[PDB]
TrEMBL record, chain B:
<feature type="binding site">
    <location>
        <position position="222"/>
    </location>
    <ligand>
        <name>pyridoxal 5'-phosphate 2</name>
    </ligand>
</feature>
<feature type="binding site">
    <location>
        <position position="88"/>
    </location>
    <ligand>
        <name>pyridoxal 5'-phosphate 2</name>
    </ligand>
</feature>
<keyword id="KW-0032">Aminotransferase</keyword>
<feature type="domain" description="Aminotransferase class V">
    <location>
        <begin position="19"/>
        <end position="380"/>
    </location>
</feature>
<feature type="binding site">
    <location>
        <position position="87"/>
    </location>
    <ligand>
        <name>pyridoxal 5'-phosphate 1</name>
    </ligand>
</feature>
<keyword id="KW-0808">Transferase</keyword>
<feature type="binding site">
    <location>
        <position position="274"/>
    </location>
    <ligand>
        <name>pyridoxal 5'-phosphate 1</name>
    </ligand>
</feature>
<protein>
    <submittedName>
        <fullName>Aminotransferase NifS</fullName>
    </submittedName>
</protein>
<feature type="binding site">
    <location>
        <position position="87"/>
    </location>
    <ligand>
        <name>pyridoxal 5'-phosphate 2</name>
    </ligand>
</feature>
<dbReference type="InterPro" id="IPR020578">
    <property type="entry name" value="Aminotrans_V_PyrdxlP_BS"/>
</dbReference>
<feature type="binding site">
    <location>
        <position position="223"/>
    </location>
    <ligand>
        <name>pyridoxal 5'-phosphate 1</name>
    </ligand>
</feature>
<dbReference type="GO" id="GO:0008483">
    <property type="term" value="F:transaminase activity"/>
</dbReference>
<feature type="binding site">
    <location>
        <position position="220"/>
    </location>
    <ligand>
        <name>pyridoxal 5'-phosphate 1</name>
    </ligand>
</feature>
<dbReference type="GO" id="GO:0031071">
    <property type="term" value="F:cysteine desulfurase activity"/>
</dbReference>
<feature type="binding site">
    <location>
        <position position="223"/>
    </location>
    <ligand>
        <name>pyridoxal 5'-phosphate 2</name>
    </ligand>
</feature>
<dbReference type="InterPro" id="IPR015421">
    <property type="entry name" value="PyrdxlP-dep_Trfase_major"/>
</dbReference>
<dbReference type="InterPro" id="IPR000192">
    <property type="entry name" value="Aminotrans_V_dom"/>
</dbReference>
C-alpha cells in the first residue's frame, strides 16, 4: 500500500533529521524490497541457469512473477520484457539493434530535454555512419514545458525519419508526453518508423498500456521504481523479437564458427541475471499495482503547487517548471549558483541535486546551465517540503 | 577469516538439510556482504552522480574503497579497474574495444573449454568481418591435465591479433598460468591482445597484474563471495585512452552539444549509467576475505576433498573425467546426468547438469569453494551409493 510507504521505508527511521528530495536520481527502498533480497542471499542463493532441484526452480518462479507484475504495470505481456542492467544499457541495445537498419538520409528526431542516455547512444550511430560515408542526421525537438509537445514533434518527422526517440517524463524539466498518442501520429506519417521511449521517470510514478501501442521499445529502471539497483527492463514489440550482448543464457546451440539464438526473450538476456534484484523488484512492483497510484500522484501534484507558490514569494527564487503537474521542481536563486545553494541545503540536511541532471542539452529550454532539482516520490510529505521552504528563507 | 566462512554464511542455517555443490555458478554469501547492502538501502540510498551533500559523498568513498581492495586482490591500481555489470558485459566490451583493430587474416586464438561469454563475443567479430569480406580466423586450442602452454604457442603465429583464454575453466577446472602464457605469446608477437576470463580464477585465487603482459582481465562477484549485478574489467594503463566504450550515457560524459559529445577520462568513460552501489557495498566486505593470508591453504584443503571424492566416487558403478588435476570442481557421469542431478536434488544435493555454457564437445558437476566441508563430500558419496 502506497499510503503507508513512509512507515515501510526504514531510511526515514534511521535518518529522521534528513529531507530527501533527490528521488529522481534514486528512490528510497521499502522494507519488503530489502528483505526479499536478504531472503535470496541467505535462504535461496542459486543460479537461474539451474533447474535440476526444486531449490533451483524457486528463483525461476520469482523471475516470472516479477515479469508478470511488470507485464501488468506496463500493460503488455511477460513474453515482451527483457531484464536489462539499467535503462542506459537497454537504450544502447536498441541503438545496436537498429544500427544496421539505417540508410543514408535517414533521420533521428530527439529532444533538448532528453537524458544523456537518450542522446549519446544515438550520436554513436550518427558518427559511425558519417565514417562509412553514409550520413544520417539528427533533428532536435525544441520543448515548451507547458505543452503536449505533439505538433512540436510532428513538425520534425518527415519521410526520411527512421527513429523517434523521446521520453515520457523528462528528468530535469519534468514535462510529460503521451507515448501512445504521439506514436499513432508518427505511424500515420510513416508506419515504418521505430519509436523508443525513455520511461525511467514515467514508470517511477505511473503505469502504461503498451499492448497495441505502435511503440517498439520502452525502457526503464528499478532504482527509481522503489526498487533495487542493477536491474531494469526493455519492452520489444511482438514483431521485432539480434542480441547486442552474447554469452550465457542466450544460446540454443554453440559449435565452431556457428551458434544459434534461443527462442523468446531469453536471447537478449545474456549472462547470469541479477536474481537478488529480481527478488527486490518483486516486492516493489506490488506498490505499483495499487489503486491509490493516481491519488498518490495527485498528492505530489498538490505539493508541487504549494512549493512553487511559496517559493515564488521568497525573494530571489524563480521556479522554472511552475504551472505543470510534474514530480520535480527546478528553480534558481538569483546570483547564487545551484552547486552552492545545494551545498547550503545539504548542510541543512536537505538532499537535493544541482545542475542540468545529465540533461546537458536542456540549457536551451531554461537558458541556464544550472538548476536545483527538488524531486518527489509517493513518500514525500508536506513536512519535507515545509523544511525546504524554511531553509530557503534562512539564506 | 575463510575458515569461519561456514559460520558467517547463513545459508547453511536456514537450509541445513541441503548441500551446495554448485558454487561454480554462484557462491553463498557471507553475512558481512548482505548486511552492508542492507545498510545502503536503509541508511544511505543515494545516487553516486550526486556530490552535493554528506550522504551523497559517502557512496563515492565506498566505491573507491571497493576499487582499492580489488586492486590489491589483482595487482595494478584503481585507475586500471572498471565496474562492469558482470563478466559477460566486460568481455563484450573488450570485443567492441578491439573490433576496429582486426584485419584480413588476423586470428583470434581461443580454446575448446571456454565459456559462452568467451566464445560468442568473438564469433560476432568473425561473422562481421566475414560479411565485409575481411574474414578473420579463429583458432581452437584442444587436454585437462596439461598446462596447455605449448598447445597454445603452436597456434600463435604472427598474423594473430588476440588470444582470449580462461585462467581457470568452468567444467574441467584446468588452470593455465596467464602470466606465463602472456610472456611467451608476447615473445613470439608483442602486438597481440591477451584477454583472460578470470571469473573463476579470481573466485578462488588472487592475482598480480602490475608488470604483466595481459591487457584485459574480466570477472564477476557472485562467485567471489559477493553479490550479483557487478563485476570488473581490467584495462592496461597503456590503452585506457585508446579504447572506446560500447555503452554511452550518463557518468561518462564531459559535455553534450548538438551532434557533439566529449568523453570523460580514465575508467569513468567505460563506467556509464547509474552504479550498483548496493553491490559495491557488498563487494567491499567480500574482498576482505580474498585479502587473507590463507588463500593457498584453503585451496589445498579443497584439493584434498577433490582427491577424496575422485577416489571414493569412482569405486562405485561412475567415471570422474577430471580426476587427477587439482581443482575446485569435479565432473562425473552415471552410465542420464540431468536425471541423476534431479535424483541428487531429491536427496537435497544441489548440483548442476549439462555442459554449463561450455557447449564444446552432459555431465554432473560438483563445484567447491572455501566453505565446502567434508560432510558435504560424504553426503554426496552416500547419496550416490544409494542409486
Ligand atoms: C528520464 C531518465 N532517463 C534516464 C535515466 C537513467 O536511468 P539509469 O540510471 O538506470 O541508467 C533516468 C534516471 C531518467 O530519469
Ligand atoms: C569462466 C566463466 N565465465 C563466465 C561466467 C559467468 O559470467 P557472468 O559473470 O556474466 O555471470 C562464469 C560463471 C565462469 O565460470
Amino acid at each position: 500500500m502506497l499510503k503507508n510507504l513512509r512507515n515501510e521505508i526504514e531510511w526515514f527511521k534511521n535518518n529522521p533529521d534528513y529531507v530527501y528530495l533527490d528521488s529522481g536520481a534514486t528512490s528510497l527502498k521499502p522494507k519488503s524490497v530489502v528483505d526479499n533480497m536478504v531472503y535470496y542471499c541467505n535462504n535461496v542463493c542459486t543460479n537461474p541457469h539451474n533447474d535440476d532441484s526444486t531449490f533451483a526452480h524457486q528463483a525461476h518462479i520469482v523471475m516470472d512473477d516479477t515479469k508478470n507484475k511488470l507485464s501488468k504495470v506496463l500493460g503488455t505481456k511477460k513474453e515482451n520484457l527483457v531484464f536489462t542492467p539499467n535503462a542506459t544499457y537497454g537504450l544502447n541495445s536498441v541503438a545496436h539493434f537498429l544500427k544496421p537498419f539505417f540508410n543514408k538520409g535517414d533521420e533521428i528526431v530527439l529532444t533538448n530535454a532528453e537524458h544523456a542516455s537518450n542522446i549519446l547512444p544515438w550520436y554513436d550511430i550518427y558518427e559511425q555512419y558519417k565514417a562509412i560515408h553514409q550520413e544520417i542526421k539528427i533533428q532536435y525537438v525544441e520543448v515548451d514545458y507547458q505543452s503536449d509537445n505533439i505538433e512540436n514533434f510532428l513538425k520534425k518527422i518527415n519521410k526520411n525519419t527512421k527513429l523517434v526517440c523521446f521520453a515520457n517524463e523528462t528528468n530535469l524539466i519534468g514535462n510529460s508526453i503521451d507515448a501512445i498518442k504521439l506514436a499513432s501520429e508518427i505511424k500515420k506519417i510513416n508506419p515504418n518508423i521505430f519509436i523508443c521511449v525513455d520511461a525511467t521517470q514515467y514508470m517511477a510514478h505511473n503505469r502504461m498500456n503498451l499492448e497495441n501501442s505502435n511503440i517498439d521499445f520502452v525502457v526503464g529502471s528499478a532504482h527509481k521504481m522503489l526498487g533495487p539497483t542493477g536491474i531494469g527492463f526493455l519492452y520489444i514489440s511482438s514483431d521485432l523479437i539480434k542480441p547486442n550482448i552474447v554469452g550465457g543464457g542466450m544460446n540454443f546451440e554453440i559449435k565452431r564458427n556457428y551458434y544459434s539464438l534461443l527462442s523468446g526473450t531469453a536471447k537478449f538476456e545474456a549472462g547470469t541475471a541479477n536474481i537478488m534484484a529480481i527478488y527486490g523488484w518483486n516486492k516493489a512492483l506490488d506498490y505499483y499495482l495499487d489503486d491509490d497510484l493516481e491519488n498518490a500522484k495527485n498528492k505530489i501534484f498538490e505539493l508541487k503547487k504549494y512549493l512553487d507558490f511559496e517559493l515564488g514569494k521568497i525573494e530571489g527564487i524563480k521556479v522554472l517548471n511552475k504551472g505543470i503537474n510534474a514530480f520535480n521542481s527546478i528553480f534558481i536563486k538569483e546570483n547564487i549558483f545551484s552547486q552552492d545553494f545545494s551545498s547550503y541545503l545539504g548542510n541543512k540536511k536537505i538532499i537535493v541535486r544541482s545542475g542540468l541532471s545529465c540533461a546537458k542539452l536542456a540549457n536551451e529550454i531554461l537558458n541556464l546551465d544550472h538548476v536545483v532539482r527538488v524531486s518527489y516520490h509517493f513518500y514525500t510529505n508536506k513536512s519535507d517540503i515545509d523544511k525546504l521552504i524554511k531553509a530557503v528563507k534562512e539564506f
